[PDB]
Symmetry: D2
Subunit: 48 residues, 4 copies
């Protein structure tokens, strides 16, 4: 079995990977939004 | 995958030559934006739940001491 | 403080929300890929 | 956000009238695909780490019994 020391180490790694996923999602969402901006601009070009 | 794509979300060359690829792409964008918001909701939940599990582990590390 | 019973309940909810995020990512990636397919088709139209 | 977008990832109306909006969108696609793969790597890691924390909690629930 695992001890309390490794359990607390796993807990710290979980929280840091969670925050890490959060930061990747922000950067991902920033890029998806710019894809959307491009798509909206293309759509309006074809209606001008 | 789990939910596979409907004809309204599948973009074919037939769609492009009809000029509806752009609007289907904008539909995909709407769905992706909502899913991203849902995943944002869940990690906030996960962060909160993990932190509560963390305080349980901490208080029992100090009952040794 | 929280008890062992709620700690184990939190653990189950964490794993189920994790799997839940995984399923949302698959569906998200499926849709991003189709956006990419559209973009690749548009790019090749402008080079034909 | 954290990493803001470079001019190579920012899509302006100036880019569209130069006909490079499509290639910048394809650049954004490449970056998004890599980030999605990274987030996939991390949840596998998170699932494995959470499960190991789970077996510690289970074995201590049964040391009561
Ligand atoms: Mg279609
Ligand atoms: Mg640019």
């Amino acid at each position: 079995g695992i001890g309390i020391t490794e359990a607390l180490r796993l807990q710290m790694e979980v929280q840091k990977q969670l925050h890490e996923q959060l930061e990747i999602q922000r950067n991902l969402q920033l890029r998806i939004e710019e894809q959307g901006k491009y798509l909206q601009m293309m759509f309006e070009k074809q209606n001008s």
